[PDB]
Amino acid sequence: SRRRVVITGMGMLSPLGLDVPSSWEGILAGRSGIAPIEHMDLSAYSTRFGGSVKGFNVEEYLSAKEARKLDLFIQYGLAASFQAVRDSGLEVTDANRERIGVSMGSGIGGLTNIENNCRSLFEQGPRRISPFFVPGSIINMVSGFLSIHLGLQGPNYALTTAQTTGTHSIGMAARNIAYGEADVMVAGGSEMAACGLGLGGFGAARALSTRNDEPTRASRPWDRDRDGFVLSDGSGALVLEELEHARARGARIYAELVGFGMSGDAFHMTAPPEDGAGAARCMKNALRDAGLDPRQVDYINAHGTSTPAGDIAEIAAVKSVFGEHAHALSMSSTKSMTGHLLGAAGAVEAIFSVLALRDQVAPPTINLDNPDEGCDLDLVAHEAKPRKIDVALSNSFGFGGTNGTLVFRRFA
Amino acid sequence: SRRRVVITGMGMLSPLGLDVPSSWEGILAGRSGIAPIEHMDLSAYSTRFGGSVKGFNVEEYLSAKEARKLDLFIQYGLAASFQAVRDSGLEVTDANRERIGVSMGSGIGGLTNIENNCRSLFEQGPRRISPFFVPGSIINMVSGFLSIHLGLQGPNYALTTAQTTGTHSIGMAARNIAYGEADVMVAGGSEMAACGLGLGGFGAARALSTRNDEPTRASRPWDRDRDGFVLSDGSGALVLEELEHARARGARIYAELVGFGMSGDAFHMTAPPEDGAGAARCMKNALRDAGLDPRQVDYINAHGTSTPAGDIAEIAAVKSVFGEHAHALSMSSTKSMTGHLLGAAGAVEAIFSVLALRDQVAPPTINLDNPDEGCDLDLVAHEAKPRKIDVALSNSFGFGGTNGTLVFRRFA
Ligand SMILES: COC(=O)c1cccc(NS(C)(=O)=O)c1
DSSP, rough: OOOOEEEEEEEETTTBBSSSSHHHHHHHHTOOOOOOOOSSSOOSSOOOEEEOOSSSSGGTTHHHHHHTTHHHHHHHHHHHHHHHHHHHTOOOOTGGGGGGGEEEOOOSSSSHHHHHHHHHHHHHGGGGSSSSSHHHHHHHHHHHHHHHHHTSSSSEOOOOOOOHHHHHHHHHHHHHHHTTTOOOEEEEEEOOSSSSSHHHHHHHTBBOOOOTTTTGGOOTBTTTTOOSBBBBOEEEEEEEEEEEHHHTTTOOOOOOEEEEEEOOSOOOOOOTTOOHHHHHHHHHHHHHHTTTTTTEEEEEEEOSSOHHHHHHHHHHHHHHHGGGGGGTTEOOTTHHHHHHHHHGGHHHHHHHHHHHHTTTTTOOOOTOOSOOOOEEEOOBBOOOOOOOOEEEEEEETTTTTTEEEEEEEOOO | OOOOOOEEEEEBBBBBBBBBHHHHHHHTTTOOOOOEEESSSTTSSSSOOOEEEOOOOOOTTHHHHHHSSHHHHHHHHHHHHHHHHHHHTTTOOOOTTEEEEEEEOSSSHHHHHHHHHHHHHHHOEEEEEETEEEEEEEEHHHHHHHHHTTTOOSSEEOOOGGGGHHHHHHHHHHHHTTTTTSSEEEEEEOOOOOOOOHHHHHHHHBBBOOOOOOOGGGOOBBTTTOOSSSBOOOEEEEEEEEEHHHHHHHHHOOOOEEEEEEEEOOSSSSOOOTTTTHHHHHHHHHHHHHTOOGGOOOEEEEEOOHHHHHHHHHHHHHHHGGGGTTTTEEEOTHHHHBOOOOOGGHHHHHHHHHHHHHHHHOBBBTTOSBBTTOOOOOOBBSOOOOOOEEEEEEEEEETTTTTEEEEEEEEO
């Protein structure tokens, strides 16, 4: 019978900071982490900026010897996972190791590593392919390398549901705990798709902002002048814990995870439907799961990708789910500042939602100068809004029309 | 209390055939799907063979427009899903479409398209990358495209847990039904890693059989002359359905999925431990989930990959779990014949496990000419064995020490 799941630990790499509090500081100040990309030459690309992780030192977590074998996406997952576990103060013993698992997801996984090894194969032949290519690049190795390093013998898996990976990864880890399969899960995602194939691939789709000359203003969710999403890199991890297990060890509890919703648009491979019908079905699943009256929802951390079609469909989905109460809650897209971390977006945004609850403040949607046709909600334009937040909601929407919703609330 | 989950439809592309009955005819006759890989220069490669899908006609499934947009691994999963849905007799309606979801996974995803779009990027630059590169290539697009073609609005996701993908996909789909989030799920996996990056990547780790001279004898699980796994292509898809829902529409029920177990080894990135302690915990977990005593098990579809470390760890884990019953059960590796479909291994093997229940026969381990040290179990060497099978287990172990077990039971 269903058990309660709380957040005891969190960890992060974002374009705004090398940890949770440095990133959060940035969210509330309305700072941008978007800048021209330097690790490669992008003069042949229509988009030349992104949300880079700045000054990451992997040797704060791992040996240079192991780091050399692993794609940045894994290094980012491990970094945030280590932060989360440390921040929970949990000690892994023989008594508990079978009851602690991990679910860290990614959309694309180790694409830099695959690109480079493709370069070696086409330039020099198959004998130049790294022996570490596969285990150093595949999406499930954040879960595997984390389990090897900490000795987690619990459920060990990884989702790839594109831009919804983070939300789904957290939600299903919660179901693991709630229904007895584990007492603790390390959950979230990591992405690093800032290579030629990513910026080029999203380029060819015409899916990205091309505001090369003002990169900090490019991601402008619900603004009339938005021209696509901003590609960003990073990681989010949370320690999810069964409540009594958290109590029994005097764990500091940030919030409760009360509800998780999934739905498929069954509409289009890449475009969300204009109405947000699938997003609406997903949010309703989440509220029912949480046993809530929708008027209890105080903050929504929107997906808010800064795409024409994506942003407007959220507004419809929300108005549709929350009727007149749509006008009373506060909804923001932190992707105004971080950009879109793809498979990591749901993970870092889950953490912002939990810190919104702890600090009783809605983060801003920056660059929202001229809200677009029908974008007439409290979108927290420009500046953080101190306010009462008892129940917070994090949405994610991805290619394949795959939707995920997380519901958190204050815990007493 | 939990809802019972049965199998009402199954679908497959394998190296043994273009559907289930053809595949299963191969398995029981002990035929091999392994052969030199064609229309592809493997001169510079230590491995020149594997399990191809022979004669696949995607225009039976998709228009040529929509098949050109999609990586072969998506084509293969869609073919298995469409087969499985057809095989179930299920009718999708506005009344049930919110209760039908998809969890089709992949280990590696769209390598072939990454290779080809890479060729474009290096030779000619980023402007030659396909607009459909990203959505044509990412692992969740079997779930995505299937949901769009059939109007499935249920839980829509994808796992990627390396060689455990297929087993985890089916188990977690079963969970979605058992606990009332869906009444039907299409679950399993697909893979097409028979490109340069795949043969090269697994080549570079010396993980592959190089018995180039006798490709049909290369896969020889538990035989003393084994020298690594054979790389194979294809897909498996099962329609999972809540029992009362199947019964109401008078569906043919193949068998019941009664148990699902997971564990992590927390040992090595690619090698299991010697004693299979992790696989042991995973099997124990599945049998507990099924309310089953180990003595009740009759058949095991092994992971049985034909690696030296992997084949022997599995024997130790079967001896540790089953003790005095370990020689009475029958355990064969159908990879002896199909080779290793990686993410799709668990799905076609769940199907072979369901048909071992239907037809009351253990598939052979072919090539088991000389059992190795301590490989003294009933491994069904050379030839299919008719016998009593009430309960059958399917095992999948994966890079990152990610373990998954499914327990099937006869239905009446
Ligand atoms: C996966 O383990 C569970 O116990 C469980 C129980 C109930 C529902 C679910 N849904 S999910 C997490 O697979 O999306 C899982």
